[PDB]
């Protein structure tokens, strides 16, 4: 509902340590450019130069907070960005603003790109009349998942499982390793019967039926062509009405409406995190009025 | 030098701490799916399903080494990927293979994705007759710089400075803070006269002349149109022949040939790391004869 | 239904870090006692002097692997301990055996003490004909959760959710802060509709019906005397066949039969981790012959 | 002699680091329940529902300090707890209160459970006229020693050595490795030099005399029957009056008066940290008026 | 030219982490002495008892900020110390002052010792009519480089490169491994043509000419006799006027003037961080009036 | 006694973490020089070019072991170094040898420099007939205390207390804060009666008598002239035969005989760690076949 409340999801203690490692990565030793700018109190304007959705204020704020700077936002989390928009002002000693600048922009750009992709996907789906959830994956940049799942939520998608613990997800490789879908789904059920859910990844109707018989909570139809996707889900919903159907594999902004259908509850797209270009933001010091 | 030599640039201690933190990110508690697959010895085939350049073997290796798995590659680092290619084979306990799969794949996908954009840019420059350096920027994913700068090098681009400690770069914001170009360049030269180089980002020809007169090693012409860019660089090289000229701002694979010019030495592209989609890789367990 | 394979659940990277920090805590500087013992090859015996269930071999093994010692076990993980039993042999340099001894016994004692409480509780419950799950809680020693939740599993109990990122549980305090059960539960269901489960802690029959109406996967009947409990539950399963029922509040080894009932699916006991005395083990060096 | 002033023993850099790891353990990713409570200002009351001694206010405070919450205590550290007592009030944003609640109660229950067991021991020892030190052991939970040693002090017991540094302690296993008591405490005496004391665990009157002859400061008489313990301690003090005698092994709250004696200076019980059940506390949100 | 400005080079995140690691080294567990002093407000005066240069205020300040203490300086950074001077006053709880006393004095004493040695070398060089850069090396105490490089700057020396990332330095061993100087600097030149500098360490005029002819930005003449050093530099400056010339190897304050010469740009000295004795500072609590 | 045994004191968990932080300090990103040397197998000789005592082999081994290099020592830990001497060989890949070279030489140079100062102070006191202990202090480089305390031991000196959790030490500032010598030491005697030692730092003979009378184990006569130090030590020994006497403050190599006396038990010298120059070592790659 409200993109403004999503920030309560982020534990305060994780932000500070996350942010501290990013700052150290960009300046591990002596910050020679501090001598160029000096330490006088300054003001920068944050400028939106790309269209999209604003996501990332919590991480932007945390970065500058460790550098004793303050941020005033002129747009809420989740806003549509119409270029060229003035979206915040940052205040602090000049060398601190310029030290935090690059990391803060990198984070805002990337989080917002993901939310902009997610909002477009949510839009395309509703424009085909589909009421299910658009979702992300675990195809995230390592070390950056907290930012990328947050960005999905701001854009209106579900984050899907955060990590491997999680919901027990039986994949192709698990079926092979366990010697059969029925053995794998039985082993996944025991591993947390109460209460984690079990999702099972299925390359065909007959695997999906076997997964549902063995007790899957969710059935993921993997890499179906749309023309076989919907018949398969119809049979499933008629035979196992309380099992949820997820479609996934090669779904993009463009072909997404072909994968929306009344018997698909969830559509997950790797593109939301692997192919969402970053938005264009700049931070510019200006003289005080 | 040669793409296989590049792996030596990676300090093995940093590799291990990066890899461990990525794994703890994807599985911070219990790995319930390890019960589904068990620990029996298995083999998995790495498949390349996107065209491009293969980059990131050192990280893929270090991920799996930490889980006591081994990798045999069938293509060298920097190889062209012609899909559908069988790129490697991974060996080890089934649960260790499946626990590292996603992290390893996510790393290789983004690293290869960046190397693929760099290769594409170096190609576009060479086909325009340009012998300069195509270069990356500091617009990298927070936490992930080591992989992305490594990706740039495998693709044939220069990484540019690794962080704020490796070359004193006077930007528009330093100029405003310092009171002006020549004040800012003087403080930059002090801050490490011997010996770090000083690069100055300039938005006008006069700003470029002031910076070169003030002793900049490198003058970066920022967001010039090509029609304004090349006459500026010609003037600069005429008056200051030992000052290198860089061009940057809004340069993409498509417009890259318009910015090549006999008086440009470096061309830096934020897009090589911010808008380079990841390649598609899978890892499929295959049965024991 | 096999305690030897539970070790696969422990991610190897989390084990080594945890063990390192335990060894650092017990010896932060110089280890003066190493000079008293020297470094000659030697062997110790592990002695179980308490009845119960043996749990914690992977942690015990990991501690001594960091100290270049080897361990041979004479009883599989989960075995019944009949004192005074010779449980294992540890081999390595004398000072390394004696450096690991206290941390290894401390971990094994507590992991086995918890598994022993868990096994006794599970034994009580099937002796009353019960088929549901005996479970643990988040009343764990801070920083020791991985050992204590693993111990629950070794003794046959369910771990319940590992931390706040598993199933969304709304408690009395959430209901007070949301201003009502059905508000709380409706927010909970949004926060991850697909797919994490939602569990609601209820003090009174009315609350549980509200919770179930609103979409709870699980209702926890908290602090019921067994007199009200089994009516309450058989009502709920009548009205809501599809919703799981959990009993919690003051359930101990002595009174556990009185909470076992046929419409109760899960019984969780904070005593399994808060009042589970450690078993008594010792490690004794013995001479070669 | 003043439990309020013990909090100065805890260095504040360590407290924040330990507290951050505990919070990170209980919520490693997104905190979904935060969307259920919101962030509106709230107050919770701390209820003691158990008899004992109150211990652990600095850790409790430090947890809620990291979460931007305040604590008001109505009982000083060390007070007797008569249930059901209102111990404190915690103020702050509701999600912040609910995120720290479990870890704060977990820490206070264990700390207090220990200080309550210590105070019982000091009560029983005082009831037998014994003026020596009741002390703890190194049988603490790995990772938690700071809380548990502090809890021993709050309840009137001596902590004993914190770690493997501190006093050099010759044990059964050292005597085996060094080939005799004389050799082991001569090597110990050398390592200890002038700053550390030497204590020797002795299971017979012969060992105790050899240890005292070879310069031990303390002799620990290990696993003696009470009838054998007191003559041994007496003859030792006659022959070596400068040597402190400690008794230890199987000493419990019920049998502790039997081990008290005018020639025992220290009595140590693993019981106080390995078998002290945690006190019952709760934290309940309430409406301001 | 301003010692008070150098503090801006220190990124505040790194300061906190480094400072906390030093406090934890000196007090890993309980601070027993805190009971001896109590927590009442106190004041202590910092006393300089050595002649030299004051350096290290940012580290001294940061230690005491972590401990909720405040510092007031009566001398700016880089001041000349004429003993016995009263250079600062520290205010805070009694136990926090005494907790930080030793770490802060150890830090200030080494930093000021390095700055004193650097200023002595600069004064000797200036008394020989030399105005090039006196420079440090990477012969720093491991883990203490930020303090030691900072102290070189306060004293008037150049820090030289901070680590293996600042400038590619071809040493004797690189030459041997590369199979010759031409191959080495060619490879070095490739590692970062634009733009890091390449310095080559040379033991003969012929090696230096080759290093220069092959592209070196700086030539370091290592362990020359002054009699052969100055003719060598004169040749290099005449045939390669843009290449900087460094002298290094065995250069001490007492022999430094013989190494000063019109064609030496940089003189670097291991002894500035390896043979620089610390200064004597004390911190004495004082009372009301 | 035997310096070769002292390596047993070093817990290997701590060595790896220390060493990792030092390597990361010296190369936080890409190691450009690795491309100059390549990765082929190589060898380097370790030369001692300063007189003194060899100390720090375990830290040197650990550095290279982290880089997959092996070290062969030709002299034992603690040897007298008669320059020039071939101390060791190091083998491994060329770029790993050159990556560890500086950190490994820095650690060995400071460790050996400290041991050399220790051995000379021990010999000075032996030549004066004195049988007490020469001791170090806590005037140690922050972060480096393990190497420096270790270096003292290899030189034949006592380390004195490692940190604040060793013996409780009442200093001038503690006396001022407690309001009296004699209330200070009683607070200190409580803070760990059994069993840590109490040392009191005294400026006058009356102060020593009060510390002795209130129960100090050790009395440090701080900054006495030798003329008054020995009369004072004699009174104390006569009145308090079991109290040990330390002498400290301004004691150097050349006046150490003046502080030796029959009633001084310990002499401690800040200069052993604050004014002990590092020894000169070099590591030289040499070609094979
Ligand atoms: O591991 C997960 O949590 C997870 C959640 C949702 C989807 N996936 C997988 O992500 C893949 C998405 O494919 P794509 O083409 O959109 O990159 C598909 O193979 C799914 O099985 C994986
Ligand atoms: O800070 C650096 O290391 C750096 C190196 C090269 C380029 N840049 C900046 O990157 C910008 C180019 O970004 P883009 O997205 O327009 O390709 C340009 O404005 C430069 O100032 C920055
Ligand atoms: O937060 C959890 O994960 C959780 C899981 C299971 C149970 N609990 C709570 O644990 C409590 C059990 O109390 P007790 O007497 O068994 O210590 C009961 O009040 C439940 O609400 C809490
Ligand atoms: O290592 C220590 O610091 C230490 C301090 C005091 C006692 N102990 C040992 O702890 C044992 C007491 O265990 P318990 O649970 O039987 O009372 C006994 O064998 C002592 O030698 C060990
Ligand atoms: O690696 C560096 O950054 C570096 C910078 C400047 C000098 N050095 C080396 O330092 C050595 C001089 O140190 P010293 O103790 O002989 O005065 C000489 O051999 C140089 O090669 C090394
Ligand atoms: O704090 C310690 O553990 C410690 C141990 C031994 C000596 N000291 C102090 O070291 C000081 C002697 O330093 P110095 O530089 O004059 O040789 C003297 O003032 C003692 O109080 C301090």
Numbering used by the authors:
A (entry chain A), B (entry chain B), C (entry chain F), D (entry chain E), E (entry chain C), F (entry chain D): 1 to 289
The authors write:
QPRTs have been shown to exist as dimers or hexamers2223242526272829. HsQPRT is regulated by the interaction between two dimeric subunits. which can adopt open and closed states.
complex with QA or NAMN as a reactant or product. the product and form a hexamer in the HsQPRT-open structure. product complex to have a more relaxed hexamer. may provide the driving force to release NAMN.
